[PDB]
């Protein structure tokens, strides 16, 4: 088992999936290298948005499947400095 995931930098990362792997567990595993908010990471099919409350088995397809992860900003609107 091996999947490809494209990040915001363009560097594809290799990871292993699990039945017990939930959208929350993936976040908890970010307790190694800080820098980005774990709550800002989500899976998105460009035109198909995934549910945070969904489990792996709930969206566990057959090997060989491209995964897309985007990091959009939503920490409040920015003030336009004139």
From Swiss-Prot:
Free-text function comment from the UniProt entry: Exists either covalently attached to another protein, or free (unanchored). When covalently bound, it is conjugated to target proteins via an isopeptide bond either as a monomer (monoubiquitin), a polymer linked via different Lys residues of the ubiquitin (polyubiquitin chains) or a linear polymer linked via the initiator Met of the ubiquitin (linear polyubiquitin chains).
Full protein stretch here: 1 to 76 of 128
Indicate where this protein resides in the cell.
Cytoplasm; Nucleus
Superkingdom as given in the UniProt entry: Eukaryota
Q: Where is this cross-link: Glycyl lysine isopeptide (Gly-Lys) (interchain with K-? in acceptor proteins)?
A: 76
**Record's protein name:** Ubiquitin
Which positions fall inside the Ubiquitin-like domain?
1-76
Give the transmembrane ranges.
Answer: none
Effect the entry attributes to changing residue 48 to R? Deficiency in ubiquitin-protein conjugate formation
